[PDB]
Design a protein around this nucleic acid. Structure first.
Lengths: 151, 205, 262
RNA sequence: UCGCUACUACCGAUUGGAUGGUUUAGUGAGGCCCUCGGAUCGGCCCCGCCGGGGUGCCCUGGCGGAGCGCUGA
RNA sequence: UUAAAGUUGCUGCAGUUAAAAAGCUCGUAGUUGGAUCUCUCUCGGCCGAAGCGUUUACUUUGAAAAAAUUAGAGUGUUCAAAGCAGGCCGCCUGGAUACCGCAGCUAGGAAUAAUGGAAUAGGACCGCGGUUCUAUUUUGUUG
RNA sequence: UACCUGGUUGAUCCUGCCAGUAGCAUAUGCUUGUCUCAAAGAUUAAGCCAUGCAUGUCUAAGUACGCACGGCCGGUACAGUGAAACUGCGAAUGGCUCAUUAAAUCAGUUAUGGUUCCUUUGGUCGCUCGUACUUGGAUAACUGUGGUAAUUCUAGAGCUAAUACAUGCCGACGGGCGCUGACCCCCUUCGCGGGGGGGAUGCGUGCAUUUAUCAGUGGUGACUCUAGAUAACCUCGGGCCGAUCGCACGCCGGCGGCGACGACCCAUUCGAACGUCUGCCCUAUCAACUUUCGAUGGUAGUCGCCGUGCCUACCAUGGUGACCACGGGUGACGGGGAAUCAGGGUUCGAUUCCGGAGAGGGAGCCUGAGAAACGGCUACCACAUCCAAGGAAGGCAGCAGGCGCGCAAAUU
């Protein structure tokens, strides 16, 4: 029901959601407490991480990942998977003989949480290193700034 | 002879790797010993460091937790009703993690009538044998007669549970990995998780 | 390989042991112990190479096997036992006492010390954790764990251990204005006052240090050992006072010190 | 444009033979894991020949035998 | 195999006739692009925290960069190549130091070069009102 | 020491190449008196191997009834020295070679807050409320009887040990803490009623394990961390809570001091593994590849030391490509480095240090902290030794040495 699209029950595993209540609890409000945590390097947890209903075990604000290592950046190129995007990093490689540089690029598959909704391609995104999330994915999207051709 | 290496795959670009060594021992994998329902049979494995792995092949009991009442009792595993990975694992009655099992509610019924003095799961005809008449109609002291009735107000149960208590079989979900710890523990399904897996089993047929 | 290495080649040894090129293929390969093998001086190098007591690597066996050697007050019958920083070596048959402190050039030194000072040593606190029915512990850089510490001991401070009992007597905390020795890097063996500590969260703290002549330097935080409260060292110091001379005035000291001869 | 001696390589009949590498299909030594199996080796019983102790009964020592006994390896 | 080879050319070659400019034009990627613009808020003892500002390239400093080799200091191996020794009449020494590209950390500079910042103002700074959630101190404790 | 010189024409000035010139490395010829260091079967064949050696090990401190010696004193459990054999530990290092291998190895840089770690060093080890002044059965060495042409092959019979293999208490031990809870007592109320104490009875109690729930001592940049509380579980292929040895000897039948072996868990040390970022030679007569059979991702699990398509089920249709993917080649193991050099460069790096790989070619295991181990085992393919023809045993890219190969490399 807007979450449970799978074949097993999507449940935030730290929160107990079957507490016994009294008559002022059943008549008052059906309140699901949510688990969120603070990534420790000055990234603000979004209000969608504190107010959402999405369930993601590899989200860096609500799931079981810890961000440690290199913090990087890149721009979005292809959002065609389930919860993960493709960013390309651009850099210049110095060739020593010619004393000149050359354009170079590398792609990264990177996990995008559902708290970063309405992300268009072509905007800068900070990524953060965690453990392997799948075969090719080892970074997690941390903040999304928009391209300068927005308003 | 299984090998859970990463170098027998293709690259992300799609190119295949020519390997740079033969299979090392720390890359090993062992066969799935699927835990079935039967009287207990565990076979210990020797894993890295000299440690132990309890590879269970048959299991019959396991302690489960009624979450909303803080009650953990050791029940009898009956059946497998639904498994959300593969459904051939239900006809084979394999106990894996997160598979929904039928347990026996009788240790929780004895806790409920001892803690709240209310008949749970009894029929409407209410044939009440005298050996539990003394725990359902006991003689109470002056301070205990108010304590039990103080417990008796919030001693309500969601009606999806009481239909399972009628037939004596609760729905439970395994939360421990039996092929690695040799136990089949877990919790009793309550509330929204219960009415999710109920309609999954109902739509399964 | 398959499982751990038991040999050390000679050229691959630590540079500060000062083993020459032509004596052998192998170097003494320190035993596992309290210290990293890059951060230690084995007991065979202290007896044969530095002190010139022994002459071969069989006489170190013959010396240590008479139980004549106590490292931190416990008798050591391993010749490759890694003695490290602030370790007290008591030889009672002759009457000397040494402490392993770095000198200004990144090596250890023969630092003879008085047996009134040899009853204690300093350690640096490395991790503090609770556990086992709520009992707090220390872990120092010697792997010495001292349960029930003072609640005002935190990480990166300095305790003072009594060596006959194993217990803490009094401590120094990590602050500015404290006298510190650098125990790693290119400023190793240098003594100065803590000026400043820049924090880099998710990376290493940099601790700017100031000399007694004005020479400022910086290190990472892990190469910092608080020796004194204020400017007074709670241990003795070597012949040089932890103050690194540049090579010009280090030459001037020699070419002016030879002129006292006759 | 048009005359002598030799080499390199290919075509080259011979459906000439021998051996590699990729796969189609079939087969599958040996180890390991599972379900069985149970050659053998004990133990506890039960009687029989019997001592002592306690008081016809119990525990002990030597054995002997039988049972599809009932367990372990 | 390296220099000689400015006969592979970044420095640093050639292309009318000696070997060589595509028959002509359009064109995406690449490469290259004209002038222009002179650090502050809430705390601790005026001095430190915390924030920056649009993001970088550049440059300078720092710390981290295995030893051996290379450079280089000291030392009459009988000289030297070496070595890490030695010297004084038990003492006094030494076993330095530099270099260690690119990438990654750090701190200062702000010229050059890329880049943003409001143009149907859902723009800045002000104090004014509303709507929704809600801190936890306040009523000697206690609901 | 930032260099040039001969050669095209009857003569000239050029383009331009040939040729010289100097190092450095492999071979080789001729020659060779002294003295100091010093490489050395890499290239071709990661071809093949006679013979011999290269891995073993005992302290006071696991097991001594071998007269094998000798020694007190001969009822003296064991004087001692001690082969053997059991037990423990090592043999996973070192040595050799460079066939593989092209984002692989590797180098620098980070991460394990995603894992194991024999050992060493420090902690902990009456924290558990429930025959011991000592438990049980075998087995070598030894004695004795044999088999086979043959092996570091072993069978049967008779004895006997343990720190091998097993089983298993007491003591601390008086209690305490949570649930229960007959009963008793107190206050107030006329009383009902309300509130507060004590309490016999039964149940469970530590630290590791596995699940669920609650509250928020110490920490980090950030934990689903560390501790705490509660309910239960705790694997017969069992988890700790010592049936162990030595030396001096004792203090008032008890109380002992130094050690040696152990030991779950924690920390450390030595590592290992799996990841992050950046980087490599030639080729387009290699331009599209990957995806039935996992290719990229999502969910649930299986396996595994753990993170992950590692693998399985169900889904989604993705992932890489002129910034040169994918395929092929390399007279490619990668670095530290070496030769040459004005400045820029170019080429080599099998080779003694670090890292990888591999023991004729693939494959699978046992043991163990650690091996997919080859001076371990089991197969298959390739060679090949003995044989009495039934069988048995192999692995020099260790040190020597031999054959073969070759231009090309030392002493059994």
């Amino acid at each position: 029901a807007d979450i449970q699209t799978e074949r097993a029950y999507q449940k935030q595993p730290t929160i107990f959601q079957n507490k016994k209540r009294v008559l002022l609890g059943e008549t008052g409000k059906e309140k699901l407490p949510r688990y969120y945590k603070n990534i420790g390097l000055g990234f603000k947890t979004p209000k969608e991480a504190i107010e959402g209903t999405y369930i993601d075990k590899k989200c860096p604000f609500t799931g079981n990942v810890s961000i440690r290592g290199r913090i990087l950046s890149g721009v979005v190129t292809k959002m065609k998977m389930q919860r993960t995007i493709v960013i390309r990093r651009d850099y210049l490689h110095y060739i020593r003989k010619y004393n000149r540089f050359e354009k170079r690029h590398k792609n990264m598959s990177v996990h995008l949480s559902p708290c970063f909704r309405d992300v268009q391609i072509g905007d800068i995104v900070t990524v953060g290193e965690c453990r392997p999330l799948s075969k090719t994915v080892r970074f997690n999207v941390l903040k999304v700034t928009k391209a300068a051709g927005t308003k | 002879g299984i090998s859970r290496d990463n170098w027998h795959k293709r690259r992300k670009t799609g190119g295949k790797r020519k390997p740079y060594h033969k299979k090392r021992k720390y890359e090993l994998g062992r066969p799935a010993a699927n835990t079935k329902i039967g009287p207990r049979r565990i076979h210990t494995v020797r894993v890295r460091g000299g440690n132990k792995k309890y590879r269970a092949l048959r299991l019959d009991v396991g302690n489960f937790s009624w979450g909303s009442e803080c009650c953990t009792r050791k029940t009898r595993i009956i059946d497998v009703v639904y498994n959300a990975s593969n459904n051939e694992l239900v006809r084979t009655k394999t106990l894996v993690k997160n598979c929904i099992v039928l347990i026996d509610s009788t240790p929780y019924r004895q806790w409920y009538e001892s803690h709240y003095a209310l008949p749970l799961g009894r029929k409407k005809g209410a044939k009440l044998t005298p050996e539990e008449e003394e725990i359902l109609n006991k003689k109470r002291s002056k301070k205990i007669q108010k304590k039990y009735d103080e417990r008796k107000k919030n001693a309500k149960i969601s009606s999806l549970l009481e239909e399972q208590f009628q037939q004596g079989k609760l729905l439970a979900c395994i939360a421990s990995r039996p092929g690695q710890c040799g136990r089949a523990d877990g919790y009793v399904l309550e509330g929204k998780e219960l009415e999710f897996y109920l309609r999954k089993i109902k739509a399964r047929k | 390989a398959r499982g751990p290495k038991k040999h050390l080649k000679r050229v691959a040894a630590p540079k500060h042991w000062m083993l020459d090129k032509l004596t052998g293929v192998f170097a003494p390969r320190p035993s596992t112990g309290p210290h990293k093998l890059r951060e230690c001086l084995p007991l065979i190098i202290f007896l044969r190479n530095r002190l010139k007591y022994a002459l071969t690597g069989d006489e170190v066996k013959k010396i240590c096997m008479q139980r004549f050697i106590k490292i931190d007050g416990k008798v050591r019958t391993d010749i490759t036992y890694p003695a490290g920083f602030m370790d007290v070596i008591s030889i009672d048959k002759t009457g000397e006492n040494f402490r392993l402190i770095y000198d200004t050039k990144g090596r250890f030194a023969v630092h003879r010390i008085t047996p009134e000072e040899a009853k204690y040593k300093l350690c640096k606190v490395r991790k503090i954790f609770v556990g086992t029915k709520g009992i707090p512990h220390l872990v120092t850089h010697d792997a010495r764990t001292i349960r029930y510490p003072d609640p005002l001991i935190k990480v990166n401070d300095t305790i003072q251990i009594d060596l006959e009992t194993g217990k803490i007597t009094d401590f120094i905390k990590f602050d500015t204005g404290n006298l510190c020795m650098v125990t790693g890097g290119a400023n190793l063996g240098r003594i100065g006052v803590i000026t400043n500590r820049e924090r880099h969260p998710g990376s290493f703290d940099v601790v700017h240090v100031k000399d007694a002549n004005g020479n400022s330097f910086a290190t990472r935080l892990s190469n910092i050992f608080v020796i004194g409260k204020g400017n007074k060292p709670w241990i003795s110091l070597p012949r040089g006072k932890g103050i690194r001379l540049t090579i010009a005035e280090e030459r001037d000291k020699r070419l002016a010190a030879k002129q006292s001869s006759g």
